[PDB]
Amino acid sequence: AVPSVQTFGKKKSATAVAHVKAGKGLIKVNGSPITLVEPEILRFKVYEPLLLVGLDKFSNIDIRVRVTGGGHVSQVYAIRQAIAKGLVAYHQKYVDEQSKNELKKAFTSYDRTLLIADSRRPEPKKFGGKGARSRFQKSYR
Amino acid sequence: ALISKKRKLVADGVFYAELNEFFTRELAEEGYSGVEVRVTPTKTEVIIRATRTQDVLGENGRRINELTLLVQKRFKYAPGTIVLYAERVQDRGLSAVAQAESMKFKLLNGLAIRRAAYGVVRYVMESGAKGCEVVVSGKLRAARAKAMKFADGFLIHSGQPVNDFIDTATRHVLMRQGVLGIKVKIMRDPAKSRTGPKALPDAVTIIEPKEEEPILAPSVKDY
C-alpha cells in the first residue's frame, strides 16, 4: 500500500496539500464544490475548460483537502488550477493516456503558464520611501 | 501555553559577549585572544585562549581560582559547576587582537613607531599568513592630523566569503598627546584553513589528464 504521496505549494493566499487520497468520483474542496456551490457571479473560469472531456467525470478521483486557505480572488485562482489538475489527472491515471495526451494537446493554449513553478510573488519594501519602489519627496531649499 | 525562548537564546549570546568584553578589559598584559563556551549538564565547558598562559596561571591558585570565584558570584552558581581553565594557542602570530595588544605595548614602552610597525608585520608574514596591513590614525608630531599605513603580501575586501578568513583588530591607545587608533586586518591562507570553504570563489583548479595508449592489437602470443 501507499501511505501518502507528496505535493504542496503556495497560492497568493492559499496553500496545497497532497491529501488526494482514494475516492469514488466526487470532487469537493470543502469551500467551493461542483455540486452545491452556487456563486453565479464569476464562472467564466469553469465555463472555459470543461467542453469536450465529459461533464460528470466522477469515476475514481476525489480532492479531499482537510485544511483550507485563500482570500477574495486567490480562491478563484486556486479552483482554476484545481479543476486543471482534476481534468488532467482524471485522464492520466485512469482513462487512457492516449485520451490524456490528445486532450492536453487540444488544451495546449489554455494553460496560461499554469505549469510554471511557484515564483510569482510581490516585492519587499525599500526603506526611505512610502511604497515599495516609491521614495519620499525631497526638501529642496 | 508555556511559550518563551527568545528570552534565553539571546541571554546565551549576551553572556559570553559581556564575559569576553571583561576579559579584553582585564587581561591586557597577557596578550588576550578570545574565548569559547559550550553548555553541558551541570558543567559549562568554558575555555579561554592565551599565549602567555604561565602568567595568568601563576602558582596554580594565584589567578584561576579567584577568576572562578568571580564568575561564580557574578551569577550565583553552585561552586563546582563552572570550570575555568586556559588553553595553549595555535598559530600564535595570527591572533589579530594579540598582535594589536603587542603593538600597543611596543608603542607605550617608548619605541619608534614605524620600526616596530613594519617589524610586527614582517614577523607575522614570516609566521606565514597570506597577507596583512596596518593603519594608525591621529597625530605623530606637533601637527594637525594624519593617518599612516602600509601593508605587504595580498589583501581582499570585500564580499561575503571574506569574513571567514579575514581578521579584525581595531584598538586604541591613550598617549600623552592624544588618543590614537590602530587597525589591522590580517588575511590568512585559504588552503590551510581546515574549516569551511577552502578554495576562493575566484579560485579554480583542474586535475591532470589520464595516460596514453599505443595501438596494441588484441592478441598474438603463446599461452
Binding site: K28, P33, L36, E38 | -
Partner: protein, 143 residues
Amino acid sequence: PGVSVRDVAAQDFINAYASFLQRQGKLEVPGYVDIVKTSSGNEMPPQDAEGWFYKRAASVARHIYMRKQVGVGKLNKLYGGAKSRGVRPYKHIDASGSINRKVLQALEKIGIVEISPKGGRRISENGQRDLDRIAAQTLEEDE
C-alpha cells in the same frame, strides 16, 4: 428527507429566516433597540426604524450551523465598523457588545445554541433535530 451534505444559499436564506421569524413574534426583544448605533464606530444609526435585529439573528444563524464553535468577540469583530475618526486615517473598531449579547440570549431562550465544552457554546441537539427533520425539510419546501 433532511439536510444534504452542504446545502447552502445566502440572501435568499437570510430573507427567508427574516420573513419566517417575523410572523412568530417569539423573539422577545429587550426594548432598548432602535436607540443604539450598532457599534462604537458607526457613521449614523440604522434607518429602517424596524428590523435589523431580526436580520442579525438570521445572519448569526446562517453560520451557527456552518461553523462548529462561536464567539461573541468573533461576532463583534466580524463587522467591527470603520470609524470616520475626524481628521484621521480611518480604522476598524469592534462592534457593540450589548446587541450581540442580547440577540444571543434571545436565541438561547428560543433554544438554538447551548453551553458546551471545547469553547463556550455550540449548536444544540435542537439544531441536530432541525437539520434532521423540521428545519431542513421546511427550507427544502420553501426553496
